[PDB]
Amino acid sequence: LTFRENAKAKTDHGAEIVYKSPVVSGDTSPRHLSNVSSTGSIDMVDSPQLATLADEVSASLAKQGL
Amino acid sequence: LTFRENAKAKTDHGAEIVYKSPVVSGDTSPRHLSNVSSTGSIDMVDSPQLATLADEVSASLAKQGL
Amino acid sequence: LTFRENAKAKTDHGAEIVYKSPVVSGDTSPRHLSNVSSTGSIDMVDSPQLATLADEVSASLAKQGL
Amino acid sequence: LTFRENAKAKTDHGAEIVYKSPVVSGDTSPRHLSNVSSTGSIDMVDSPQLATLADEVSASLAKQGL
Amino acid sequence: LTFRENAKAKTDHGAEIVYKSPVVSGDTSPRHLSNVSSTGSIDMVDSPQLATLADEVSASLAKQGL
Amino acid sequence: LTFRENAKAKTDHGAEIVYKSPVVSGDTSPRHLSNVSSTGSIDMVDSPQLATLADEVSASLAKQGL
């Protein structure tokens, strides 16, 4: 009884072989990927709060969040 | 009884072989990846709070968060 | 009874072989990766709080956090 | 010039107050949460490999992983 | 100038107060949480390899891993 | 100039007060939490390798790991 498994990359006359090899030359920058699984929760995810009150502000409110 | 497993990369006449080898030449900067699993929770994730009150502010409120 | 396992990278006439070898030449700076598993919790993760009250601020509030 | 900040929980005639206090009476067991940020990598995450060859096995292969 | 900050929990006639106090009565056992940030890497994370060859095994292979 | 800061828990007629106090009565046993940050690395994390060759095994291989 005989079994053969072969995985082959074969080149004559001089060129590159890339075998099971991830190559990343480009710049990689995914931004703001939110994966959320929530039950019964109060979640602020990727949800920054910016408030500015400035230059002669009276009797005034910024209300943010939950 | 016979078995052969072969994994081969073969080049005649002089060039690169990259075999099972991760190559990263590019710049890597993923930003703000939030993965959240929340049950019954009060979560602020990746959610900075900035408040400025400045230059003649009276009787005034910034309300942020939870 | 016979077994042969071969994993082979072969080049004639002189060039690079990279075998099972991580190569990182690029700059690496992933930023703000938040992984959160929360049950029944009050979690501030990657959620800094900055408050400035400055230059004639009276009877005023920045409320942030929990 | 006056400011008053109040957070109040008030009870007449005898009952529990739970204030900013996480309470977990249930059993907590999240299983197999994989968070993966990958660039140019060979990653096996949460990916066990089980191989059994048993009881009269001849000239045979189990091939797993990357 | 006057400022008052109050955080109050008040009960008449005898009962529990839980204030800024985490309470965990349940059994806590999260399992197999993998958080992975990978660049240009060969990572086996939470990925055990089990191989059994047993009871009359001839000319045979379990190949696992990388 | 006047400032008052109060944090108060008050009960009339005798019962428990838990103030800024972690209470853990449950059994705590998180298992197999892997946090991995990898650049240019060959990492086996929480990835044990078990190989058994037993009871009439001939010309046979378990290959695991790297």
Side-chain angles (χ1 to χ4, degrees), chain F residues 26-54:
Chain F
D27 293 347
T28 295
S29 64
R31 315 289 184 106
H32 310 289
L33 315 191
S34 294
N35 303 305
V36 179
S37 181
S38 302
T39 179
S41 296
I42 305 177
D43 298 331
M44 305 194 297
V45 185
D46 202 7
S47 295
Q49 293 128 69
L50 314 189
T52 297
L53 294 78

Tab-separated table of all heavy atoms in Angstrom, chain F residues 26-54:
chain	number	residue	atom	x	y	z
F	26	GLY	N	-18.404	34.341	45.727
F	26	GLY	CA	-18.408	33.297	44.701
F	26	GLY	C	-17.014	32.738	44.405
F	26	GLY	O	-16.003	33.383	44.683
F	27	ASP	N	-16.935	31.544	43.827
F	27	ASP	CA	-15.656	31.003	43.358
F	27	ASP	C	-15.242	31.648	42.030
F	27	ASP	O	-16.019	31.728	41.079
F	27	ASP	CB	-15.679	29.471	43.268
F	27	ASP	CG	-15.798	28.763	44.626
F	27	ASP	OD1	-15.631	29.406	45.688
F	27	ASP	OD2	-16.005	27.530	44.638
F	28	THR	N	-13.996	32.105	41.955
F	28	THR	CA	-13.451	32.791	40.781
F	28	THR	C	-12.345	31.937	40.168
F	28	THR	O	-11.311	31.696	40.790
F	28	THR	CB	-12.957	34.193	41.168
F	28	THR	OG1	-14.057	34.969	41.581
F	28	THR	CG2	-12.331	34.939	39.993
F	29	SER	N	-12.538	31.495	38.932
F	29	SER	CA	-11.559	30.706	38.180
F	29	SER	C	-11.681	30.958	36.670
F	29	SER	O	-12.096	30.067	35.929
F	29	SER	CB	-11.657	29.218	38.560
F	29	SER	OG	-12.906	28.666	38.196
F	30	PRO	N	-11.345	32.165	36.182
F	30	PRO	CA	-11.062	32.366	34.765
F	30	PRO	C	-9.953	31.408	34.298
F	30	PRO	O	-8.975	31.189	35.010
F	30	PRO	CB	-10.628	33.830	34.658
F	30	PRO	CG	-10.049	34.153	36.028
F	30	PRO	CD	-10.944	33.337	36.949
F	31	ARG	N	-10.110	30.829	33.108
F	31	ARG	CA	-9.188	29.848	32.512
F	31	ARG	C	-8.811	30.244	31.093
F	31	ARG	O	-9.684	30.619	30.319
F	31	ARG	CB	-9.791	28.432	32.472
F	31	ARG	CG	-10.527	27.871	33.692
F	31	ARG	CD	-9.591	27.552	34.855
F	31	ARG	NE	-10.336	26.929	35.968
F	31	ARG	CZ	-10.316	25.657	36.336
F	31	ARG	NH1	-9.665	24.745	35.682
F	31	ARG	NH2	-10.973	25.261	37.382
F	32	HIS	N	-7.554	30.063	30.715
F	32	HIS	CA	-7.107	30.196	29.319
F	32	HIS	C	-7.449	31.577	28.740
F	32	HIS	O	-8.063	31.703	27.685
F	32	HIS	CB	-7.634	29.020	28.474
F	32	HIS	CG	-7.362	27.672	29.095
F	32	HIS	ND1	-6.118	27.055	29.208
F	32	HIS	CD2	-8.296	26.876	29.685
F	32	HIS	CE1	-6.330	25.900	29.857
F	32	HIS	NE2	-7.630	25.769	30.155
F	33	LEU	N	-7.101	32.633	29.474
F	33	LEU	CA	-7.154	33.997	28.957
F	33	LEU	C	-5.779	34.295	28.359
F	33	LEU	O	-4.789	34.372	29.084
F	33	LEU	CB	-7.549	35.020	30.041
F	33	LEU	CG	-8.725	34.657	30.965
F	33	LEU	CD1	-9.124	35.904	31.761
F	33	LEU	CD2	-9.958	34.150	30.237
F	34	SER	N	-5.696	34.428	27.041
F	34	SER	CA	-4.452	34.756	26.343
F	34	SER	C	-4.550	36.168	25.792
F	34	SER	O	-5.363	36.428	24.913
F	34	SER	CB	-4.181	33.770	25.202
F	34	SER	OG	-3.923	32.483	25.704
F	35	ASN	N	-3.686	37.061	26.254
F	35	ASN	CA	-3.491	38.373	25.649
F	35	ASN	C	-2.105	38.409	25.007
F	35	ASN	O	-1.091	38.228	25.678
F	35	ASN	CB	-3.699	39.488	26.687
F	35	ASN	CG	-5.072	39.427	27.330
F	35	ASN	OD1	-6.084	39.439	26.658
F	35	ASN	ND2	-5.161	39.378	28.632
F	36	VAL	N	-2.064	38.631	23.704
F	36	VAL	CA	-0.846	38.544	22.905
F	36	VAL	C	-0.722	39.781	22.036
F	36	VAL	O	-1.584	40.058	21.211
F	36	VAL	CB	-0.841	37.242	22.079
F	36	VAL	CG1	0.402	37.140	21.211
F	36	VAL	CG2	-0.894	36.003	22.979
F	37	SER	N	0.382	40.499	22.188
F	37	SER	CA	0.838	41.502	21.235
F	37	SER	C	2.168	41.023	20.648
F	37	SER	O	3.155	40.909	21.376
F	37	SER	CB	0.936	42.860	21.929
F	37	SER	OG	1.359	43.852	21.023
F	38	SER	N	2.199	40.729	19.351
F	38	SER	CA	3.340	40.123	18.655
F	38	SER	C	3.707	40.879	17.393
F	38	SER	O	2.888	41.109	16.506
F	38	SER	CB	3.071	38.661	18.283
F	38	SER	OG	2.786	37.926	19.440
F	39	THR	N	4.984	41.205	17.274
F	39	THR	CA	5.586	41.729	16.053
F	39	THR	C	6.784	40.867	15.684
F	39	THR	O	7.629	40.589	16.536
F	39	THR	CB	5.917	43.226	16.184
F	39	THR	OG1	6.520	43.662	14.992
F	39	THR	CG2	6.872	43.588	17.321
F	40	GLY	N	6.846	40.396	14.438
F	40	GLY	CA	8.006	39.670	13.926
F	40	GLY	C	8.413	38.437	14.743
F	40	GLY	O	9.603	38.166	14.857
F	41	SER	N	7.470	37.753	15.389
F	41	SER	CA	7.747	36.721	16.398
F	41	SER	C	7.237	35.342	15.981
F	41	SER	O	6.335	35.224	15.161
F	41	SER	CB	7.175	37.136	17.758
F	41	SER	OG	7.809	38.310	18.235
F	42	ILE	N	7.817	34.292	16.551
F	42	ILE	CA	7.283	32.932	16.479
F	42	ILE	C	6.785	32.588	17.883
F	42	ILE	O	7.579	32.235	18.752
F	42	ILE	CB	8.332	31.926	15.962
F	42	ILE	CG1	8.928	32.349	14.604
F	42	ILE	CG2	7.664	30.550	15.851
F	42	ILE	CD1	10.033	31.423	14.083
F	43	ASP	N	5.491	32.762	18.134
F	43	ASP	CA	4.908	32.601	19.468
F	43	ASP	C	3.966	31.406	19.551
F	43	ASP	O	2.943	31.346	18.880
F	43	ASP	CB	4.213	33.883	19.952
F	43	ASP	CG	5.144	35.091	20.095
F	43	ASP	OD1	6.349	34.900	20.365
F	43	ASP	OD2	4.656	36.238	20.043
F	44	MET	N	4.290	30.487	20.453
F	44	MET	CA	3.378	29.461	20.934
F	44	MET	C	2.914	29.902	22.316
F	44	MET	O	3.679	29.866	23.278
F	44	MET	CB	4.084	28.103	21.005
F	44	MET	CG	4.718	27.714	19.672
F	44	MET	SD	5.223	25.976	19.575
F	44	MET	CE	6.473	25.891	20.882
F	45	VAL	N	1.668	30.341	22.411
F	45	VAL	CA	1.052	30.820	23.652
F	45	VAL	C	-0.137	29.940	23.961
F	45	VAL	O	-1.005	29.752	23.115
F	45	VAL	CB	0.638	32.299	23.568
F	45	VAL	CG1	0.108	32.790	24.919
F	45	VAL	CG2	1.809	33.181	23.136
F	46	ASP	N	-0.172	29.365	25.156
F	46	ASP	CA	-1.272	28.516	25.614
F	46	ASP	C	-1.621	27.409	24.592
F	46	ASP	O	-2.775	27.108	24.314
F	46	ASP	CB	-2.459	29.395	26.035
F	46	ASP	CG	-3.413	28.679	26.999
F	46	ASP	OD1	-3.100	27.550	27.445
F	46	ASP	OD2	-4.417	29.307	27.397
F	47	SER	N	-0.592	26.865	23.941
F	47	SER	CA	-0.718	25.919	22.826
F	47	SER	C	0.157	24.691	23.099
F	47	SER	O	1.105	24.431	22.357
F	47	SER	CB	-0.391	26.616	21.495
F	47	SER	OG	-1.335	27.625	21.202
F	48	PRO	N	-0.108	23.940	24.188
F	48	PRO	CA	0.644	22.732	24.500
F	48	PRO	C	0.539	21.710	23.367
F	48	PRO	O	-0.468	21.621	22.663
F	48	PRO	CB	0.067	22.189	25.810
F	48	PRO	CG	-1.350	22.744	25.833
F	48	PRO	CD	-1.193	24.098	25.144
F	49	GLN	N	1.597	20.931	23.195
F	49	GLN	CA	1.681	19.878	22.195
F	49	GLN	C	1.819	18.538	22.903
F	49	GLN	O	2.784	18.324	23.635
F	49	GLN	CB	2.860	20.156	21.264
F	49	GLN	CG	2.644	21.414	20.407
F	49	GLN	CD	3.821	22.359	20.517
F	49	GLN	OE1	4.908	22.073	20.040
F	49	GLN	NE2	3.660	23.502	21.145
F	50	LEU	N	0.858	17.645	22.694
F	50	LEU	CA	0.883	16.271	23.191
F	50	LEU	C	0.965	15.311	22.000
F	50	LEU	O	0.119	15.360	21.108
F	50	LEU	CB	-0.327	15.967	24.097
F	50	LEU	CG	-0.704	16.998	25.183
F	50	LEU	CD1	-1.785	16.404	26.092
F	50	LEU	CD2	0.452	17.372	26.111
F	51	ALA	N	1.962	14.432	21.998
F	51	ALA	CA	2.127	13.369	21.014
F	51	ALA	C	2.269	12.018	21.724
F	51	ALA	O	3.141	11.845	22.576
F	51	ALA	CB	3.320	13.671	20.103
F	52	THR	N	1.430	11.053	21.362
F	52	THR	CA	1.548	9.655	21.798
F	52	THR	C	1.770	8.771	20.586
F	52	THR	O	0.936	8.751	19.685
F	52	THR	CB	0.295	9.195	22.559
F	52	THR	OG1	0.159	9.953	23.734
F	52	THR	CG2	0.350	7.723	22.972
F	53	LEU	N	2.869	8.023	20.575
F	53	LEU	CA	3.080	6.895	19.678
F	53	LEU	C	3.177	5.641	20.549
F	53	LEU	O	4.094	5.546	21.365
F	53	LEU	CB	4.336	7.102	18.812
F	53	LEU	CG	4.292	8.257	17.792
F	53	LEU	CD1	4.517	9.642	18.402
F	53	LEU	CD2	5.375	8.039	16.738
F	54	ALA	N	2.255	4.689	20.418
F	54	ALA	CA	2.195	3.552	21.343
F	54	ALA	C	1.592	2.282	20.733
F	54	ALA	O	0.696	2.355	19.907
F	54	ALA	CB	1.402	3.982	22.583
